[PDB]
């Protein structure tokens, strides 16, 4: 087509979605991790994670307001990844990289799994 | 902080939100324009438009599944702007610029109003 494109549009949309999350506006699901609860928007979770995409396209699970993650999932690793979903920023540190990579593999967040693998390989 | 950032994350999120819109997945509102109906996600509409942000933060309107726009709004102008919300791409043409600018002013989409004003000024 002959469209023009606003470079900062996608980043501005994500920034606003994160502002809605902060203020708990139109959040429609609670993700439960080892008795730690995280409110979010189903559509953002689906847009970021192969696991949530599969969960919320299921005819029965699409209607659930609570999703319980596998007990092996670390709440801090989940929190770091939820922050990444809404900001594009990943708080990757020596002390959390193993939990973050394990959580990203479970959530099916391929680009995160990739940078964790590379950061681990650099330290060996 | 000491975060790393994935450059393409925001664009990838928006691309996936548009794929959900195409497949009518988790759309939670119908926008009615001169008897033309458009399904969308409230959160994306709020992230893009000052008008929808005001509508869906209202304690009564946040719960509506149908929103009727002012009868002066042109369905094609709305369609072009809805496409822009989900893609960052604006199909601005000599034949639609007046309707697009009028719709963007009503929806409170300041960056669109700005490029329409500039494109109109160049033709005078």
């Amino acid at each position: 087509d002959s469209c023009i494109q606003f470079t900062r549009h996608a980043s501005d949309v994500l920034l606003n979605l994160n502002r809605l999350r902060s203020r708990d506006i139109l959040t429609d699901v609670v993700i439960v991790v080892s008795r730690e609860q995280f409110r979010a928007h189903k559509t953002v979770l689906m847009a970021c994670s192969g696991l949530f995409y599969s969960i919320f396209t299921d005819q029965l699970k699409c209607n659930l307001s609570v999703i319980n993650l596998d007990p092996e999932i670390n709440p801090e690793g989940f929190c770091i990844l939820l922050d990444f979903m809404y900001t594009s920023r990943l708080n990757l540190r020596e002390g959390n990289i193993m939990a973050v990579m394990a959580t990203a593999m479970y959530l099916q967040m391929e680009h995160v799994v990739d940078t964790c693998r590379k950061f681990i390989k650099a330290s060996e | 902080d000491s975060c790393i950032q994935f450059t393409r994350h925001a664009s990838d999120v928006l691309l996936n939100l548009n794929r959900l819109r195409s497949r009518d997945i988790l759309t939670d509102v119908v926008i009615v324009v001169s008897r033309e109906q458009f399904r969308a996600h409230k959160t994306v509409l709020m992230a893009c438009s000052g008008l929808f942000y005001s509508i869906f933060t209202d304690q009564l309107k946040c719960n509506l599944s149908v929103i009727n726009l002012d009868p002066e709004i042109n369905p094609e102008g709305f369609c072009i702007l809805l496409d822009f919300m989900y893609t960052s791409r604006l199909n601005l043409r000599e034949g639609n610029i007046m309707a697009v600018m009028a719709t963007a002013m009503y929806l409170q989409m300041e960056h669109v109003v700005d490029t329409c004003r500039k494109f109109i000024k160049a033709s005078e």
């Binding site: 469209c3 023009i4 494109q5 470079t7 | 791409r89 960056h111």
Partner: peptide, 4 residues
């Protein structure tokens, strides 16, 4: 704004 740019030409994509």
């Amino acid at each position: 704004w740019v030409i994509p």
